[PDB]
Subunit: 96 residues, 2 copies
């Protein structure tokens, strides 16, 4: 497959790795989404404790842990979180 | 980076290389997207003749050539096209 298709396959796979067995495909509960981020992003617990933005996103996932998210919302979150965590990692390199 | 991060990296990267100059970052025009899909998906034009939905999207891409889509919309569409174009059942019919 092409590069785009292989990236898409990896993300759909990783999405449904955290899906409940009863849920409509391409949907997650916010609790499951939170577990996804803690396990599938680089040093997410470090990033989330030191960055107010990532912290407020994650605490909203806790408040509505049973509400469901679709694939679009998942893509919004991951893209925003990776951007915020990269700024955080880059700046930690200058502190180290 | 993790696998999810590298996968998202590949898509941001592909998204931006078909991006024009006049674009607020993380947005893309439906016309530019059509060029992206034709060159970045396997035999995209032939999947259009095999699925009704893929045909609909392409004609929406041409009717609103100058409307713009954000990055998540593009990713969601790619998820739709990859699911629709590489369906297990359809492919095993084309023996």
């Amino acid at each position: 497959p092409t590069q785009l298709e292989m990236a898409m396959d990896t993300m759909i796979r990783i999405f449904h790795r955290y899906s409940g067995k009863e849920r409509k495909r391409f949907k997650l509960s916010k609790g499951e989404l939170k577990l996804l981020l803690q396990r599938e992003l680089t040093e997410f617990l470090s990033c989330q404790k030191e960055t107010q933005l990532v912290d407020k996103i994650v605490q909203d996932l806790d408040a509505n842990k049973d509400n469901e998210v679709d694939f679009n919302e998942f893509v919004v979150m991951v893209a925003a979180l990776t951007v915020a965590c990269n700024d955080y990692f880059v700046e930690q390199l200058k502190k180290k």
